[PDB]
């Protein structure tokens, strides 16, 4: 088993209950290091509509020792929550956030319609409509370079066959469930029990 015990509780509450979440293209990453793991809070809360745990099972079998837990938070539209699965393709998957096909983690997603929709629309959350190439697993593109779509040089300004690579979601308070924001906190585990920097909450060794 061989895990150490750190009295420091892991700040999953910080990640999940944060006031402001990042956009999908500029996906915010936090490293959960050197703390005891809290996973049953997530399991029992049950207000998380999507709790898809690849690799590890979501039925109370994640009391495991991890050397590294990576937490990623972004806000996307409801229709593309399926998009962010291992080995799936779409706009969000190939241009904003790509999940490795061997992902051993938990894609956690819940509604933020009250929090992340503002009257007259909320345009704070962006997404990359077009990009030159498909995005590699765990890569953030913050470039604002005008996408080329024609022989004409973009010259840095937008126009025909030259577009701003990013676009606004535009969540509205009265809108379809398919068109409402879902905060997603992708949890990436490494499942190494020998270093086990991220302590598991079971009795020591």
């Amino acid at each position, epitope marked *: 088993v061989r895990f150490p015990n750190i009295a420091n509780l892991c700040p999953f509450g910080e990640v999940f209950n944060a006031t402001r979440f990042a956009s999908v293209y500029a996906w915010n990453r936090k490293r959960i290091s050197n703390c005891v793991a809290d996973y049953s809070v997530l399991y029992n809360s049950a207000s998380f509509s999507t709790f898809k745990c690849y690799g590890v099972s979501p039925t109370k079998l994640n009391d495991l020792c991890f050397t590294n837990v990576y937490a990623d938070s972004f806000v996307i539209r409801g229709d593309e929550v399926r998009q962010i699965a291992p080995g799936q393709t779409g706009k969000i998957a190939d241009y904003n956030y790509k999940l490795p096909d061997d992902f051993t983690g938990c894609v956690i997603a819940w509604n933020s319609n009250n929090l992340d929709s503002k009257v*007259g629309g909320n*345009y*704070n959350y962006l997404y990359r*409509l*077009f990009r030159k190439s498909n995005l590699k697993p765990f890569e953030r593109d913050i470039s*604002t370079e005008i*996408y080329q779509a*024609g022989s*004409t*040089p*973009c*010259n*840095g*300004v*937008e*126009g*025909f*066959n*030259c*577009y*701003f*690579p*990013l*676009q*606004s979601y535009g969540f509205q308070p009265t809108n379809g469930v398919g068109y409402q924001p879902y905060r997603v906190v992708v949890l990436s585990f490494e499942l190494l029990h020998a270093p086990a920097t991220v302590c598991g909450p079971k009795k020591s060794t």
Partner: antibody, heavy 122, light 106 residues
Framework: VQLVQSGAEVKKPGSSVKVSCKAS????????INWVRQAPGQGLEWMGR????????NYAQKFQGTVTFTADKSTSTAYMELSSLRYEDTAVYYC????????????????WGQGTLVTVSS | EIVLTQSPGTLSLSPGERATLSCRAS???????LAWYQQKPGQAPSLLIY???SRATGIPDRFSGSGSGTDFTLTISRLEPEDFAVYYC?????????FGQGTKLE
């Protein structure tokens, strides 16, 4: 919806000036700001655009190196800096908002400010 | 660069009814990405039309643009007393958003 800017600059030749176009709430969010030089008794010249959210300002070949576009995300105000007053630089500087987003595909100036005229004097 | 040449240089002579305001470009305007701006004297130009014929908000539909490729038309059904300003052409088709010279400048 309203983009009230500066008035008139008593700038002696060679002395720099900064413009102060004021964006209303939500203008900066989804709209870029464009500057249009209107030299007295000529046509409209497109100096360039500033995308406030990502702080991107691109200028035309003519005005490159002679003018600087800045915008303040807090207070929602657009600024344009003239390097110095060259003799031909006297003009009515305008400010207008264009959609920069791919879906809208408008890239045209919807609303305009009153105008800021620079000159040797008043 | 896409340049523009407005042909009817001076139409502020109180003309009657239809006016065939034109604008042509060296390379054809692509995607009908042209707009028309009305510069009332002493004031800043207000958008009058955009696209090939897409009328602006708060502008009477009598002002139309019958443009193919480069938008070379702007038709006002009646020349009302208020509408005697300087109408401008602008293209946003991958250039430094070059304008025209103006069409009804006294």
């Amino acid at each position: 919806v309203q983009l009230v800017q500066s008035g008139a600059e008593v700038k002696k030749p060679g002395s720099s000036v900064k413009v102060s176009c004021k964006a209303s709430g939500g203008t900066f969010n989804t709209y870029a700001i464009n500057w249009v030089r209107q030299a007295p008794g000529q046509g409209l010249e497109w100096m360039g655009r500033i995308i406030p959210m990502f702080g991107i300002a691109n200028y035309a070949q003519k005005f490159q190196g002679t003018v600087t576009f800045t915008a303040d995300k807090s207070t929602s105000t657009a600024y344009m800096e003239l390097s110095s007053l060259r003799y031909e630089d006297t003009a009515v500087y305008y400010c207008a908002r264009s959609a920069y987003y791919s879906e809208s595909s408008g890239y045209y100036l919807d609303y305009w400010g009153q105008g800021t005229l620079v000159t040797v004097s008043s | 660069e896409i340049v523009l040449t407005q042909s009817p240089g001076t139409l502020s002579l109180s003309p009657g009814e239809r006016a065939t305001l034109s604008c042509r470009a060296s390379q054809s305007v692509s995607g009908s990405y042209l707009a028309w701006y009305q510069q009332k004297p002493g004031q800043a130009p207000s958008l009058l039309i955009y696209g090939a014929s897409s009328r602006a908000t708060g502008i009477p539909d009598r002002f139309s643009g019958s443009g193919s490729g480069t938008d070379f038309t702007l038709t006002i059904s009646r020349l009302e007393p208020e509408d005697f300003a300087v109408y401008y052409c602008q293209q946003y088709v991958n250039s430094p958003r070059t304008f025209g010279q103006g069409t009804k400048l006294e």
